[PDB]
Amino acid sequence: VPSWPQILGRLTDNRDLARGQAAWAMDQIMTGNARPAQIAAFAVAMTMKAPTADEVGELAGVMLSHAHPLPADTVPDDAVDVVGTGGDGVNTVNLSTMAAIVVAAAGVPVVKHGNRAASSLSGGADTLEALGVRIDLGPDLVARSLAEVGIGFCFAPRFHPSYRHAAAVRREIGVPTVFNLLGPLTNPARPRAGLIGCAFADLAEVMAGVFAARRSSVLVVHGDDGLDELTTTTTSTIWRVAAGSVDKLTFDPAGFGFARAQLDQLAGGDAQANAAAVRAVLGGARGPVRDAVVLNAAGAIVAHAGLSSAEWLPAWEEGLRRASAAIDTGAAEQLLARWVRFGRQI
Amino acid sequence: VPSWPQILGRLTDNRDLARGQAAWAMDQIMTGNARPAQIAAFAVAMTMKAPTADEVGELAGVMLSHAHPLPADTVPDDAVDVVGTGGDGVNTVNLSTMAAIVVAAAGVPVVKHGNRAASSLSGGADTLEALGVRIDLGPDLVARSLAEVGIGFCFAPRFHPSYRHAAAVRREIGVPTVFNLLGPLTNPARPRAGLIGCAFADLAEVMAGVFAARRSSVLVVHGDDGLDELTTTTTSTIWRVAAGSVDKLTFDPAGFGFARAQLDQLAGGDAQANAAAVRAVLGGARGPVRDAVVLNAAGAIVAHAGLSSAEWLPAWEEGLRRASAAIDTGAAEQLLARWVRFGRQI
Numbered sequence: 141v142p143s144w145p146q147i148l149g150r151l152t153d154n155r156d157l158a159r160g161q162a163a164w165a166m167d168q169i170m171t172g173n174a175r176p177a178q179i180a181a182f183a184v185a186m187t188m189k190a191p192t193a194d195e196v197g198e199l200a201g202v203m204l205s206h207a208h209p210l211p212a213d214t215v216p217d218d219a220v221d222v223v224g225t226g227g228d229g230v231n232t233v234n235l236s237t238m239a240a241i242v243v244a245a246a247g248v249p250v251v252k253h254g255n256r257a258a259s260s261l262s263g264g265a266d267t268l269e270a271l272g273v274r275i276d277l278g279p280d281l282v283a284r285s286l287a288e289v290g291i292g293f294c295f296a297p298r299f300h301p302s303y304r305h306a307a308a309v310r311r312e313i314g315v316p317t318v319f320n321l322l323g324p325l326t327n328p329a330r331p332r333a334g335l336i337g338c339a340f341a342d343l344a345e346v347m348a349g350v351f352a353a354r355r356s357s358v359l360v361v362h363g364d365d366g367l368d369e370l371t372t373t374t375t376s377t378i379w380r381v382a383a384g385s386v387d388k389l390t391f392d393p394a395g396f397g398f399a400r401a402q403l404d405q406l407a408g409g410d411a412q413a414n415a416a417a418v419r420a421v422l423g424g425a426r427g428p429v430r431d432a433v434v435l436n437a438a439g440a441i442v443a444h445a446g447l448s449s450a451e452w453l454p455a456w457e458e459g460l461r462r463a464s465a466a467i468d469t470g471a472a473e474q475l476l477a478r479w480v481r482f483g484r485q486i
Numbered sequence: 487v488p489s490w491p492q493i494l495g496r497l498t499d500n501r502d503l504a505r506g507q508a509a510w511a512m513d514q515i516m517t518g519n520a521r522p523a524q525i526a527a528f529a530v531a532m533t534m535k536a537p538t539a540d541e542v543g544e545l546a547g548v549m550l551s552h553a554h555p556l557p558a559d560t561v562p563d564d565a566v567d568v569v570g571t572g573g574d575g576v577n578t579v580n581l582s583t584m585a586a587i588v589v590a591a592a593g594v595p596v597v598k599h600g601n602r603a604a605s606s607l608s609g610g611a612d613t614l615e616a617l618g619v620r621i622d623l624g625p626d627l628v629a630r631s632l633a634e635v636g637i638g639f640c641f642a643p644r645f646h647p648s649y650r651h652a653a654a655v656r657r658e659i660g661v662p663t664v665f666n667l668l669g670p671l672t673n674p675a676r677p678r679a680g681l682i683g684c685a686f687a688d689l690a691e692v693m694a695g696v697f698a699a700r701r702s703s704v705l706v707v708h709g710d711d712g713l714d715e716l717t718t719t720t721t722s723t724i725w726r727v728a729a730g731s732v733d734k735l736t737f738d739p740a741g742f743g744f745a746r747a748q749l750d751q752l753a754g755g756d757a758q759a760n761a762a763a764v765r766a767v768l769g770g771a772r773g774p775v776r777d778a779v780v781l782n783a784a785g786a787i788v789a790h791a792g793l794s795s796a797e798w799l800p801a802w803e804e805g806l807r808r809a810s811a812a813i814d815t816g817a818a819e820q821l822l823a824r825w826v827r828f829g830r831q832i
């Protein structure tokens with residue numbers, strides 16, 4: 141017999157939950173049965189206890205069970221996502237969003253999950269919108285986007301309406317919680333590959349564990365400077381997930397000849413400014429922003445390769461080649477134009 | 487400057503707050519400006535971080551600033567409280583309420599703060615009602631009761647109307663938090679002495695520190711069997727507060743000739759059953775219930791003596807003797823009758 145007092149008491153006592161308890165809590169939240177005070181108490185208590193992979197897997201699994209899915213047979217087996225938790229506090233240009241366009245332009249199907257800014261000036265969805273991409277499309281039109289353009293974007297509020305009670309609590313309290321992990325774990329098209337950024341060093345392993353229990357090829361990444369992206373300012377920690385297991389490693393882009401950047405060189409601004417940065421990179425401008433875009437695009441291409449599995453180093457070399465070429469041949473610039481066109485034609 | 491994200495982020499990072507932050511959170515809560523999700527996040531985060539005496543002092547001082555006071559010059563300089571957090575999850579007779587009647591009958595002014603049951607079947611207030619005592623009196627009438635009877639009772643909801651937002655959240659989440667500490671620390675008559683029970687072993691020291699900052703003469707007690715009272719079933723831990731300093735002691739009633747009782751000998755029931763138990767003890771019945779009442783009454787008398795202090799052991803001997811005589815002379819049974827008579831005169 142589950143209840144709020146039982147579950148919250150267990151968490152405040154600093155104990156992992158029994159199997160099924162996280163799922164019961166999440167289902168109460170998803171069906172509008174939880175009071176705002178109960179939602180907040182659960183999110184905070186779970187965060188301070190330190191969630192396990194099994195618990196987060198129950199939360200995400202329940203949340204997925206309530207999502208709008210894409211129509212049957214519309215997502216290719218080898219589709220990839222590129223998305224992070226956000227909340228890194230650094231306010232960069234939209235690296236994941238740029239990388240995703242480059243990846244699609246390299247010939248890899250991309251189905252991106254994303255959302256507006258939470259505490260940054262412009263999130264991926266905001267920048268896309270400022271670019272003229274339609275972010276508001278439902279299941280059928282996202283699947284058309286994917287078939288006709290090679291990329292689709294699932295706007296979280298549109299695909300996860302039942303999450304609205306949790307989302308409101310998240311805003312009211314502001315502090316990052318276990319809920320901040322859920323976006324990347326709940327892409328409603330359920331792609332089997334991903335480059336997944338985590339701002340919280342402690343929780344990246346937990347996210348990796350969740351991907352390990354799915355049929356997934358994923359790189360969960362944390363820049364050692366705190367970015368929820370593969371960084372160019374220093375090393376990054378990567379949890380490589382495949383075949384139900386995890387291989388944690390230290391990754392250094394200087395091994396591929398990247399010069400060290402400074403965080404300020406990756407600094408962003410508002411939607412219009414971050415949109416300008418996208419157009420600059422895709423038009424071929426050289427420098428630290430392109431470098432970081434290419435690095436993350438290659439990471440996603442490496443995750444995609446893990447599905448029909450090349451070894452680690454050769455996969456990276458090929459991913460960096462394909463990502464650079466997608467920019468230099470105009471393919472990425474052309475694909476964005478094509479994506480904007482698609483949205484304008486209804 | 488202060489906000490929820492700042493204050494909740496500090497606690498989730500397991501850091502003590504900066505001075506004034508708990509005070510800010512409490513004024514948001516008491517003004518009706520905190521959302522229930524914010525109240526709950528704060529209560530939980532504070533609990534799992536582990537509150538300091540300074541933080542709890544800010545919460546209680548802000549709360550008291552919003553409470554109705556007693557009229558000026560109506561609380562004796564040497565009034566005492568007898569009250570605990572409750573929440574020990576044991577079903578006992580109303581030990582604090584019985585001890586308070588005996589203490590008042592021994593000639594020590596008692597101004598009791600209290601409230602109905604939260605998890606037990608009958609709380610102090612409910613049992614008092616069943617005995618015919620009027621528990622819902624305003625400041626002027628509590629003051630008159632204290633002057634004419636020697637005891638008065640401040641019904642928390644009547645004295646702390648602005649706490650209703652927090653009390654609703656407490657109920658909704660069910661789990662004990664730092665807020666469970668506030669009752670004993672926010673007696674609106676501000677008696678300077680007390681016997682204060684704490685159901686949560688780790689938090690008793692924090693309660694003791696808040697009393698120490700006030701220069702109160704208090705014994706904060708926790709039975710080693712988990713009671714928020716001085717127990718007769720085993721030893722107790724007492725944090726003695728005197729001269730603005732706290733020291734921990736183990737207390738063994740066997741040293742005063744008390745036999746070891748069993749927990750079920752102290753079992754209570756509904757309001758009516760607990761009212762009969764009060765009447766039995768005041769009528770001079772021997773047994774484990776009288777023993778426990780006498781022990782706790784002695785503890786309050788010791789605390790009272792510490793206002794104008796005297797050696798520990800003879801203070802206790804005199805306390806036990808004063809409590810026993812108050813019963814055996816008929817004075818305790820007579821005081822309850824006077825108290826009931828006072829309420830009927832209104």
Ligand SMILES: O=P(O)(O)OC[C@H]1O[C@H](OP(=O)(O)OP(=O)(O)O)[C@H](O)[C@@H]1O
Nearest residue numbers: 224226227234236237258259260263264
């Ligand atoms: O405001 P923050 O909480 O810091 O979040 C910034 C962005 O990071 C995530 O998306 P994504 O990785 O898709 O966006 P990106 O293109 O900026 O990397 C999130 O959905 C936000 O849009």
Ligand SMILES: O=P(O)(O)OC[C@H]1O[C@H](OP(=O)(O)OP(=O)(O)O)[C@H](O)[C@@H]1O
Nearest residue numbers: 570572573580582583604605606609610
């Ligand atoms: O329902 P619970 O959370 O377990 O709390 C039981 C009682 O303990 C506190 O009062 P007090 O110490 O004044 O009453 P007592 O006479 O019952 O000891 C509280 O105000 C309740 O009346």
Ligand SMILES: Cc1cccc(N)c1C(=O)O
Nearest residue numbers: 296297300301303304307
């Ligand atoms: C911000 C958000 C993210 C994911 C799902 C939602 N329903 C929402 C919402 O605001 O309703």
Ligand SMILES: Cc1cccc(N)c1C(=O)O
Nearest residue numbers: 224225254255296323324
């Ligand atoms: C809804 C979503 C999807 C993918 C990543 C996210 N950070 C989010 C989010 O934090 O709102």
Ligand SMILES: Cc1cccc(N)c1C(=O)O
Nearest residue numbers: 642643646647649650653
């Ligand atoms: C339970 C309680 C304790 C102290 C003050 C209150 N208003 C309340 C209330 O229920 O409103």
Ligand SMILES: Cc1cccc(N)c1C(=O)O
Nearest residue numbers: 570571600601642669670
């Ligand atoms: C309001 C109050 C006063 C004194 C002790 C308590 N436990 C309480 C309570 O928890 O309601």
Ligand SMILES: [Mg+2]
Nearest residue numbers: 223224236337
């Ligand atoms: Mg990102």
Ligand SMILES: [Mg+2]
Nearest residue numbers: 224226368369
């Ligand atoms: Mg980022």
Ligand SMILES: [Mg+2]
Nearest residue numbers: 569570582683
């Ligand atoms: Mg008590």
Ligand SMILES: [Mg+2]
Nearest residue numbers: 570572714715
């Ligand atoms: Mg008790």
